[PDB]
Symmetry: D4
């Protein structure tokens, strides 16, 4: 378990992170974390490591792109003095290119995305114990579907950044890809983005595996 006792773990992202969490503070055991993967992570950490006393904060905001993260980073991240920051962003940065292909101010292209995400990591790294970069995802098994193909480009950038900055790394697309060998996307999310409890569990598990969570502790 990478996260130590008494430490503060902060999640940021878009609606997949937000999941109806309490605004502004996003902190507490009884609904304030929202109802998706963040909450599941905390639940599992408390069920299996209750003695760790890990404080968890949810700063997800529905609709955000990486440009929106940068715009609130000082207030929502820096000022919170976290020990661990988990970032999952990119879905909207890409989706807007496909659902509003002519409202282009809504799009964040890849080279802007890469530099902005890097800028967030590099600002934050000297202030925290660790950073966890979660790729965006798209629940779609055809690599050549245009949005899936774009999303994968953004996920490759995330991986690159994590390597180069010594951040932890969660490939959420690889986790979905496995389940997509069996299930058609609609069984997980009609819109291919916002999933079921199952999708959130896929994400929660992917995150917990990367931080060295044990389902039954050996120690």
């Amino acid at each position: 378990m990478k996260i130590g006792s008494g430490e503060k773990l902060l999640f940021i992202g878009d609606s997949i992170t937000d999941c109806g969490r309490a605004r502004p503070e996003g902190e507490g055991s009884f609904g304030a974390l929202g109802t998706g993967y963040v909450a599941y992570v905390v639940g599992l950490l408390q069920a299996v490591y209750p003695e760790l006393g890990i404080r968890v904060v949810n700063k997800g905001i529905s609709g955000n792109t990486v440009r929106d993260l940068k715009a609130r980073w000082e207030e929502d991240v820096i000022a919170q003095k976290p020990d661990w920051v988990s970032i999952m962003i990119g879905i909207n940065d890409v989706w807007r290119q496909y659902d509003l292909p002519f409202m282009k101010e809504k799009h964040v292209y890849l080279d802007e995305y890469e530099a902005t995400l890097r800028s967030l990591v590099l600002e934050t790294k000297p202030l925290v114990k660790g950073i966890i970069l979660m790729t965006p995802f798209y629940i779609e098994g055809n690599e050549q579907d245009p949005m899936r193909r774009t999303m994968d480009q953004y996920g490759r950038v995330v991986k690159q950044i994590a390597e180069e900055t010594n951040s932890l790394f969660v490939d959420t697309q690889a986790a979905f890809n496995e389940v997509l060998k069996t299930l058609y996307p609609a069984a997980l999310a009609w819109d291919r983005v916002a999933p079921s409890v199952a999708g959130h569990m896929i994400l929660a598990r992917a995150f917990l595996r990367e931080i060295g969570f044990e389902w039954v502790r050996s120690r």
Copy 2:
């Protein structure tokens, strides 16, 4: 994994099982399974065993005792033709004795509890592939608190029926007891009964472990 491909798993119980499930069907949407351990179970099974093709049904009803289960058993269990039935009942059977001590017809005392639950297990066993008996629980660490002491006795009844009937058995009290070495009850549930996400994860993990779930499959 005790549960196998193509099987229908039906959960029944009180509010801990219900958690806002869709009535009457308790199946078949996103959200139809409720927002507690039953949903978490189905999500983790889907995340880790997507190919198993399990159908899951949530017949939990808030407020039920085992007397209420008996009254709807035919329509809600037997008529559903499940392959597997999971029962978690007893919390209200006990809690009414303590919160409404003078309304005795709302109590289900130990003789009624054992005979009824026994009868339901005996009746159902030959019609299904398997039964899972979950103990009720009380989120309270002091064995001599009166309601914890009573709830532990009711759990002994469940354990003994499961043994007699070669049912699977989940000791939910023991799962909470482990966490209660560290956390005061209120950290998990103000009222010592209806817990947080963490509590429902304690439950879901206790269920899954009993049915041979692996967090990361070795094969």
Copy 3:
């Protein structure tokens, strides 16, 4: 114009047809026809052929398959004594196979679909002046996506019944396909099924063209 003065045109289908229509009557206010292609059809007919005096009824019901149509056919179609019946069914028959793959009784497979739809068309044809058969559709441009591939097969069934029965025929998939040369699905419908105003205009225009509507009447 195939539809003539004084005729009653009854539309039946699933949510794509329903679009919040008034239940049970589906006629006779402002708003009773719902807010999608059925209403747009009635509006354009009124704008361009005000003198035609068409009565229009919307018997769409959200969630329906052709099995559901059959169960209400007598009350909702035959008892209404329509002159013209428009049917657009199949989306849910197919989508349940993909979004709830393990709940097989909710699926309407191709044998049940063809026999039922056929039976309804055969039964209705001698009681009415005319039938319009609209294909189901899936807003997805890749023919080998599994649900698009299945939906195209169901459309072939509709086309063949319409041919056998000398019904009018609207290929809604082809209409979407044309736009999908330019737009990614999400621009029209996140879930690839329930579209925007633009999608409903694609539908209404496909219907109208089949019934000989002219945007500006040449006579």
Copy 4:
């Protein structure tokens, strides 16, 4: 098609334009345009010219007279940097004279109306590719009904302005007049102002005809 690819088309007016559109921005494919003729225009343009990539904004505000348009013109029009502006105003400027004939500060008389509308056109013309002036209307077939007779005076002024400024021109009253040869007003709008889907389609079609929309493109 007068409108070219990538261009921005902005509609302004009163409730007939507003139709519940999103405030303040009035822009987007999924409800932000409101539910009347603006939305229908955009829907048809996307269904038939999807590749044009026309951005559309709805700045209608219920209750407005031309005096209200002038009061918000800088923020709602100029600042938006549209390529094409469509104006439909006058209904309220006239209605108030008839429904609140003694709260006269609510009235905009014809010579004030004419000069204010001219002032809007002349300010805007050097900043855009084109302007479309839609007459107000009143759904009433008797030319001598007092409100209809007044409304027609205002429509004549609009036509004059469009001629003199080389603006495009939509005679909405002429479009209703045709349908009113068959339908009594109440079949379109009980209040003779705010119509049904049919009325909105009459308006949408009138607008699309003036911009050179083709229902089936020859090219």
Copy 5:
């Protein structure tokens, strides 16, 4: 005053009579009589003839034609044992011809109107002390508007039945006509049917004058 001490006066009609009255009783609170002319009548009678001890019942139902009255006559009129029955019906009988011209079964044409209303008056007259027949009305000053022209014909029917049957008679159209020498319809009712407080006062005053009310009693 035609109405006398201790008598029960029952009003029946459509929405103009209903005005949100309490269903089913239409009597007996504060507010049970609705918020239009029926309530105003009861208030003025109470203000000026408090000692009369009149019981008043409002059996108006929004949307009703005389065909609807007939279907509930036994339960809503005869079973109430009124001493006086006031009927104001015809607006919807006529308006459906104009707002839904093609839904002919919703129309109540003049032959059905005269026969039904006649039958109800003949049947009720020997069971009660008196009947008041109020004409329907249309708030429209042009006699040749088609719906006003039709409504005036229906009023002639009412006047003739009242004459034949020695019923009291209230010409509501004439009352509106007087005000319409000064006000355009919209000042009283946008839709020419459901008026303001002023319109309901026009009605209440027309009723009261017919029953010999004095604003200031001379005795």
Copy 6:
């Protein structure tokens, strides 16, 4: 009729005047005047004198005492530039003495009441055509009931003020007293203050009689 054409009549008072009127402006034919005596007055004036073109504004505010009137007089009265002001105040000034007999900052005693009301009249008189002073009231027939006895003292002061300032005068208590010879208070208002439609008609009539309203005009 004391009120001439084109003139502005403003009512101020407490909840008996307010009756849910539109805040802040309190002006319009379709609900803005609220649902009690103000609205009835306007309704009758329009039904019988439609050609007068009297503008009416309702500045009633529930809970007000005369001290509250003074606090808003500049904004709510002076600034409105009325031609006629009607004041009805005192109910709360007195009620508070009886319902909150120990929260005394809520009480306005008689000599404060008298001087404040005088101050309002004397400020306003040089700015308007006329002032109408309506007494407060209490719907209670026993002159010696403590609140009734107090209320009458306040009504005597109002009368004195009106005499001394040449204001018009409405004795609302005398109007209720007449009806109270027959009806027990509860038949008009359970709380003896806020009446039924009948009470509002008693008030409306009292006001209209003082301004020279004719129910059937001789001229």
Copy 7:
């Protein structure tokens, strides 16, 4: 204390008893007893006699007269097998005579009141351990107010039945009368019937004193 351990005490009445109690059971939660004197009684008994183990049921129904009690007596009283029945009825029996003087079938005059209440007491007495008869009341200090005078007569009937039948007896009017030496009615209840917390405490204290409650137990 007249009530003893293990006994079921059932309260019945009108709104004063109901106070929002849970329907139909009126027992068994927190809140099921309503928010007035019945709840206060149960609370004080629990605070001071926790060991008594009393079951309490609230069968009050807003609006009831003794005629309504009779119609539900079998289901709501006798079928509950109470040991003690407390009845407080008469307020509406009387108040309808005054607030709806002309709707005579809603009145329960003294002959009907005495015979019915008598019959219910006689019928119930041999089936239960004891009966408590509470007078109705009117919060009004003037004995010659007409409704107070009538209510006092109805109270005399209750007192006489209680005497005849050796029922316990609570004179609620006398309890209010004592406070009314100091407070005007409006301080306790604007409408002289439905009081504040203070009024319900007056009631609860009057009940408790009659059943031998001690505020501080001497033993």
Copy 8:
């Protein structure tokens, strides 16, 4: 009775005091005091000492610790110029230690609690006639339950402070302890903190006993 006529009694605390009281003023006989022990105290004082004319204000705020009281003391207490101040605080100061044992900024430890509470008393004492210190409580009969054991430490501090400052003193824990000899906590409050009407009556009675309330006055 320690409280004299005309005096102002102000209660402050957490949710147990607040009970939904009116914000900000917390003053009035008809709901403004909230629905728990404060309201019951006032009710009893009015029922038994109506002539005292005691003004009562409720400044409870749900969630408060003693640190929160200090933060609002000037506005909510000092500025109100009370004659008597009742303080009940500590529940949250302690609860947070047990329900959010790792969000420690939410905890107020005992020595901070003691000094802050002292600081409140010492500031206030020279400004008022008297102060009443009510201990916090926890509805839990086992002295060794961790939260109960902590709560008792805080109650001992309260008692010490009251002794040292000559404040009145209410041991709310001792009052619950008596009832807990018979009832399990859940019969009074599932969460062991927020009780039933019974709990509020236990508190109300404890407070009234300390101020010398007599249930039947000797004088």
